[PDB]
């Protein structure tokens, strides 16, 4: 059980963060209400995206303050767990190359 996407690698000293409305990776197999979740720093730090209510912090509600967790959402998302998406079995599915919409702020080091 894995993230659906490849990682964001942190080459600098700043934690990952995004402006409100930014940071959810593109996934055309998902719908506008689905576009909400968290990045988790693993364990150069690698940060992996998980849809809300899935993955290692599936129990956290949106906005929970935890070191190594940041929250992201896109306009149109619904704040409901994405049990229908869940996580990725790497034996069954390749990781989606993490892709952000054009114009997204990325902090230095990413």
């Amino acid at each position: 059980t894995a993230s659906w996407f490849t990682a964001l690698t942190q080459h600098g000293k700043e934690d990952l963060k995004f402006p409100r409305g930014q940071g959810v990776p593109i996934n055309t197999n998902s719908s506008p209400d689905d576009q909400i979740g968290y990045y988790r720093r693993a364990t150069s730090p690698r940060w992996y995206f998980y849809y809300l209510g899935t993955g290692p912090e599936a129990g956290l509600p949106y906005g929970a303050n935890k070191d190594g967790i940041i929250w992201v959402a896109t306009e149109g998302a619904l704040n409901t767990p994405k049990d229908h998406i869940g996580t990725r079995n790497p034996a069954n599915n390749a990781a989606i190359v993490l892709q952000l919409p054009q114009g997204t702020t990325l902090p230095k080091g990413f």
Partner: antibody
Amino acid sequence: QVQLQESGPGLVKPSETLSLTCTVSGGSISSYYWSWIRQPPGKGLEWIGYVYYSGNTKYNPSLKSRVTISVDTSKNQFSLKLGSVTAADTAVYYCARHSRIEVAGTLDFDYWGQGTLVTVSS
Amino acid sequence: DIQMTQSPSSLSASVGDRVTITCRASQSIRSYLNWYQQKRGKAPKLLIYAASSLQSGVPSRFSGSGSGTDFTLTISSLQPEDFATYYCQQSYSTPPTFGQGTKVEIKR
């Protein structure tokens, strides 16, 4: 403060289509989710469906086969059509706004209309 | 769908008493749970969201508690204007579903 207003109360004949409109004032339709919710007399609340300002909808599976919800941003309105009604559809019909958390909508209904009583009767 | 079960169906309590009403879900919904107040002839009014967050403008005698399947709404000091039917509602997944309500009256 945001205000929601359903169209006026009255009759719908059995097997015909119920049509209601919700007009939003003091606020904008854009960026929020909006729902229709109903309450038969003496009973509890049943969610009918939601619409997002750009047009996508989602319906209660119990009603999906005979309901449409539409939205008209230029009129700051959204509307319900419920077909093939029977006495089981007699209810107060509410329009309601979903709250937001950051840019996400919730399933939390933070503003409601007054309610309009629709009686299904010949 | 997720079934919400409220208890009791009705209760009476004196002004200044604590009132606690229960809502239980058929599956775990963590803290995705809202409470509404409904007066006769009026729309429901959101009191509590996310199981325990007080909606802005709602008096601080209202609280919510629980996470998972077992939730309560507490009025810590009942006031004469607090008669109403109170409803819970899971906000975890569509379709959002409501309990059948608890009617609160003021004992005098």
